[PDB]
């Protein structure tokens, strides 16, 4: 894939969004390649932490859209795949806010353990209701978990914006960095230059325990979310609102 | 009813309490009637968005008062059939707090999706421990879930209102409008005209959808609490407790 | 015991850590104890709210440390066994913090109903990982429940502290004194005195009616979380780990 | 109590049906007794087994029957107490069934861990739709586990017995004594001389342990159903039905 | 529909497969109208029982078979809607078994509450495995829950029937009446005439408060498993055996 | 090991206690044993069913009995580990009963998928309260499922066998061969005959599947199983009865 990099220092699997210039619009292959780089570190004994960082103004802008449309099939098997693949990973999940993130991309930053900001730009995005659609991404778990239930349908029912404030009055961001939006790269490196010195001296398998009895908390309600939330969706792809829609 | 009022605007369907020189004071059979109006909305397939408004400095009272007196029987009836038209609602509801909500009142407050207040000195009081009875209308699961568990013991425990402060310090309000509590009236439309601009543009289904999806993750623990809290009330009042204390 | 006493005020069962001298370090004896004025609070039916009120600077620095050392199963069992005893309390139970908890007692810290701070420079450190350890004393789900769950991985993961900002964002602390850590005796006095206006007026079996339900949502997750917190800290015993870490 | 009997040998608690004459039909104060026998000996230390025996040719004809008719909360008053005190009992309950039983005994015979046939003419009986009612004493989830799904909507939509035949089938039945009807007295005696062999060598608290394990599978269902039960037929009592089939 | 015949007598929804010379083999189209008899029967208040009857020496043959070929999506979208029809039906469903079922209309004769046999030549046949397929309409609860475990495994694992002996075994079948298979229409009219008998007297709206206090002990269980079911099958039908096997 | 072998043929994975001069009384280290067998059976790709056989006249006499006296950690262990290991397990597990099984091994027996007998003189034996024990190797859900829970009791309370009337009355056995006891050897390969011919034709990895959806209707009660019997038998092993009787 020529959009995602990764590579691994240490006990740190690192995984890029690398292509500002499309603010990194991601396609079904890409949601594909980000299971598959999770399924990667998952595997490797090595790794403890897996980073997902991006590049530019954006984190992602989200889906990039360009009976054979019936290639709604491949759509719903993408995002399934891709959420369940955050919703089981046992390494601690930290996400590198560089910016804001919309639709199926703003879902798995909310399935993140750990969510910094470069600043206080950033917003989540999830404009289901715009787009004739409904939950998805496990979302109808992680945002009343993660911004309450009031919040939520705010900014859901009103295609409204979970912006920095919100975030901060959450919980939501472990430590926003406080610098310009034009260099997510200085962002991206001191954000691991601070997990550098975070994990000197602890005992790394003592996070994948706790990460693990943490997660037994929720897994049900993630799991079901995934799939109630495809099951949910298909007479609103049956009617055609989203075909019409997603066009303008 | 000449105490409440409803009447129909597209996709909004809206409740009144006008009965401000009573405090909105609510009997047993406002309460029934209330339930009504949110059976006559959830059947409406055009109707959305359920709004409840009310009138004047309060938003309500709570309950109103004046072996006959296993009149307590029709007590627990009321309150257990509005607590579950409110817990099975299908369509957005939205609170307008114009002002204070107390007891049972107070109670269908807190299971509204979305509340909005007109200013900085509502406050919600649940005043069970001073009646010699327990937590009603469901608020045993949607006081810990909006307000956190340790605030919901120490206004619960001490008799103590949930104050503005703490509303907006748990996201329960999604805006404050920061008008004079001298006209509700004022308020009441300024909400329906924010109302009327943010639905424009949206597939309006998408926000049941959502809400069906949202509402799944607590129905039974809401409908369960419902039950085992009139069952562990009637103990309360076979001692005779709370008819003294409903009494000065 | 001579590092722990307890008495009895009307509804208060008053239990203090008297030892701080030592920083209120505690031994597994000491938690067995505490374990036991629990169940001396729990079976009095005078006694409505057990407080738990400590000495000098620290509320407690956490466990004291001085195939025998098979002397784990010692340490697992008193672990299990307090933190049992403050899962099903029935009585109110308002923790006095006079400054920060580590360890097990930061654990208990946490399945307190109410706390109150002393002044903001108290602190709860659950060095898990730092000591080749997991999650204990229930943290599993008093933390994510209480603080939000990226906020618990921040702070878990890392071995950082939840300090006293973090813990006013989510209201884990009903009030803050504002008083002078050098006396945690004034301390004391001044929240039993504004404990002894709160009851006046209300029905007290009321608060332990509240209580019962409120406990009801959560307690099947707590006593698990007791279990397998246990459970999956063996094998890091049996791996050696937390052996080394124990001794400098 | 004239018509309930009781006495402790060694290990066994014995109660027993005395009122041959009336069939050992009971009423509301006889089920209320039955309840306080059980919370007696669940709290005796030296019992470790609850023997329910009856006299005369049937086990119990249930029910002994005869606005104040708001006596009806008198009667499931009744009937909540004593199957809730059959559901939580710690005891090894042991049914001597000397015939048939009919109704709210029946339904408690279907909650004892063990049952023991007189004969072959032994039934049971649950005519709730010939009574314009609806499951009560936990038979809602007893008869399903213990006979079969279809049975159980056999016997239940057309008032039909549960025969010796099915009892069999099912293995309801630990063993037929294939004695007379005319002496449930020496059918009495000879169960509890083959209970007196059998626990011979036993660690007793082995069974209360294995009990308690046992029990966990199915103790929310039977809590929940003894509450669901209730509050699902007050629309019956309300209509009118069971007041009219309750004279002939 | 053709195939497809229903009245009404009484409180009695009749539905009978009229289809003989075809041993009443059904189609996608078929199982949605036997859906949509379900819809009108649950929401018809004079009903009370659905009854599901045959024709000739064949209850159902099951599914008749003659990338559009995706095809598949209707072949899945007809068994989890008439399987969602008979798991969520109010009346009571009794089914009259006049020979043989196979695949999914033997899963549906699994979801009755009560099922009459004609002889002990009827079987049932669920050929999951000869097809390269999985478990579907709901069979992965009912099985284990009407036959037992270890019986269920034998016969789906090695596609072995589940004949009269082991129906009658586990009390799958209320009664058999003996009758030879040259004529379904005389059993047809024999089970009506005994259900006239059979609900004289009773209060009917009772049959249908049990039912629904009954169904709630596995209603999630079987919502689940139409859901998961056909989840876990779509792997199947991508690697392509089920379309191999499906021609011969 | 010297008394457990294995073989591979086809698409079984055979599992062989080969000690009939001991009856195959096992010691921890032969369920450690028998449990990593069970873990090559999971991973190998090419097997679908892992079948167990002994040999001699007994399937297995149990536990083989010859502060270090504090073995019993090693003697849980393996209880929690080989039951851990039939539980998971994603093949067909079918035992082979050439005889009676007793304690643990019994216990194993109960947890396969299929078992088959090789005469009527076979039984099953829990003698836990003839020990001084509780539950174990998750009978505390296995028994009740497959036998009913009053006869369970009637096993359990008084350490009475399962024997084969009752074997064949809940359908725990599929098929008994009705062979001599003094040839297990022949019974063994008669079974092996029978599963080639009923495997042919077949589509294997749909044998896995049904598995898969069948094992979740109770894989969480198994392994909350597994735990809580642990917990609970510590006291016993504290106390100090099953050391005593562990000797005579």
Redesign the interface.
């Given at each position: 894939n020529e959009k995602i990099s990764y590579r691994i220092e240490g006990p740190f699997f690192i995984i890029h969004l690398i292509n500002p210039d499309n603010l990194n619009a991601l396609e079904g292959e890409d949601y594909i390649y980000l299971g598959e780089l999770l399924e990667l570190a998952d595997r490797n004994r090595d790794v403890y932490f897996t980073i997902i960082q991006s590049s530019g103004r954006f984190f992602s802008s989200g889906a990039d859209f360009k009976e054979t449309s019936?290639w709604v099939s491949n759509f719903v098997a993408r995002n399934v795949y891709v959420t369940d693949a955050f919703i089981k990973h046992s390494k601690?999940l930290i996400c590198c806010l560089n910016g804001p993130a919309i639709g199926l991309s703003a879902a798995l930053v909310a399935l993140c353990?750990?969510?910094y900001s470069i600043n206080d730009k950033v917003y989540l995005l999830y404009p289901?209701?715009?787009?004739?659609?409904?939950?998805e991404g496990g979302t109808?778990?992680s945002l009343?978990?993660?911004?309450?239930?009031?919040?939520?349908?705010?900014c859901?029912?009103?295609?409204?914006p979970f912006k920095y404030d919100?975030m901060c009055?959450?919980?939501?961001?472990?430590?926003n960095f406080n610098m310009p939006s034009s260099n997510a790269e200085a962002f991206n490196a001191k954000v691991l230059e601070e997990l550098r010195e975070?994990?000197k001296?602890?005992?790394?398998?003592?996070?994948l325990?706790?990460?693990?009895?943490?997660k037994?908390?929720h897994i049900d309600?993630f799991n079901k979310?995934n799939?109630?939330?495809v099951?949910?969706?298909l007479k609103?792809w049956v009617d055609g609102?989203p075909l019409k829609?997603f066009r303008q």
């Open positions: 019936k601690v353990d750990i969510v289901f209701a715009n787009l004739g659609l409904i939950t109808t778990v009343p978990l993660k911004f309450g239930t009031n919040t939520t349908y705010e859901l029912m009103f295609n409204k919100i009055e959450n919980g939501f961001i472990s430590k975070k994990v001296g602890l005992y790394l398998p003592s996070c325990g706790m990460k693990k009895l943490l037994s908390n309600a979310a799939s109630v939330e099951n949910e969706s609103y609102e829609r």
